[PDB]
């Protein structure tokens, strides 16, 4: 089970290579493992997540059609890290410690640190195989709309949400400095990640490296977290924290409904 890596720049065909390679491998081998280091071009997840996905069914379309449940998941929050290249590389270890042939998608340390056996490039066995902003944002807000499509059997505000008092779920606002008193407005009508780790706020102090289990939307808080979840009801009980990141509900959800 050699570990396969991918190293490429913009417009080289690496995602299509991953799709084609998984499709070819699914004929002979029964299962294949997938590790995603991309944060803005995630395939099986909503944007901003680092995950070790698993494939048992072939991939025959765009990334917003084959959403699966990651084996291991971390909700970084940001679609791309450009100033803190010591936490994403630190998150990778927490995600990598769950590893069937493995495909590693990437955006010297990355080539190392994983004990790989293949460094396929599509631009340690060198192979190579030598082969916009407004359009890359539509597919990032289209995978989120695909995660919310699991709530349909119904208007998005019409479904019955869950409830939790302000003493059973903690709250953290990643990638911001929100004043502790004025924090219920940064989480009201937002897009929170239902991660896992009376009175009012239960705020944390540091950003934890948790295991995200799903994604939910808060709809309102009157002085009860009315949290709408597409997560299966069996998995809601383990949810005990909320982490807001640089990923909000698509404006079409919040805009004019019918």
């Amino acid at each position: 089970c050699p570990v396969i890596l991918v190293c490429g720049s913009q417009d080289v065909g690496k995602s299509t290579f991953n799709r084609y390679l998984i499709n070819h491998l699914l004929n002979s081998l029964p299962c294949v493992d997938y590790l995603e280091c991309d944060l803005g071009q995630t395939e099986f997840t909503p944007p901003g997540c680092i995950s070790l996905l698993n494939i048992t069914e072939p991939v025959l379309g765009p990334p917003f059609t084959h959403l699966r449940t990651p084996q291991k998941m971390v909700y970084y929050g940001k679609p791309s890290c450009k100033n803190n290249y010591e936490n994403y590389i630190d998150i990778v270890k927490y995600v990598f410690s769950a590893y069937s042939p493995l495909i590693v998608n990437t955006m010297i340390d990355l080539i190392r640190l994983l004990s790989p056996s293949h460094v396929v490039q599509f631009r340690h066995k060198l192979i190579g195989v030598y082969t916009r902003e407004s359009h890359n944002k539509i597919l990032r807000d289209l995978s989120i709309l695909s995660y919310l499509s699991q709530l349909q059997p119904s208007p998005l505000h019409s479904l019955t949400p869950y409830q939790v008092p302000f003493n059973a779920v903690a709250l953290r606002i990643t990638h911001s400095d929100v004043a502790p008193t004025h924090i219920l407005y940064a989480v009201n009508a937002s897009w929170v990640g239902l991660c896992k780790i009376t009175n009012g706020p239960i705020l944390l102090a540091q950003t934890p490296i948790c295991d995200c289990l799903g994604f939910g939307i808060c709809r309102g808080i009157d002085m009860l977290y009315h949290i709408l979840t597409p997560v299966p009801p069996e998995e809601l009980r383990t949810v005990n924290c909320l982490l807001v990141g640089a990923i909000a509900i698509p404006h079409c959800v919040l805009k004019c409904q019918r």
């Binding site: 505000h157 479904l159 869950y162 924090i183 407005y185």
Partner: protein, 35 residues
């Protein structure tokens, strides 16, 4: 744990996606802290 399925509530029908106007409805002066 405490995760109530909201078995009986009726309000959400028209546009309560953020209207559940005085800027003090969810105002706060006290907060806990974990570590």
């Amino acid at each position: 744990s405490a995760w109530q399925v909201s078995s009986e509530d009726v309000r959400w029908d028209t546009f309560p996606l953020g209207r559940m106007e005085d800027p003090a409805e969810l105002m706060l002066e006290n907060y806990d802290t974990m570590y």
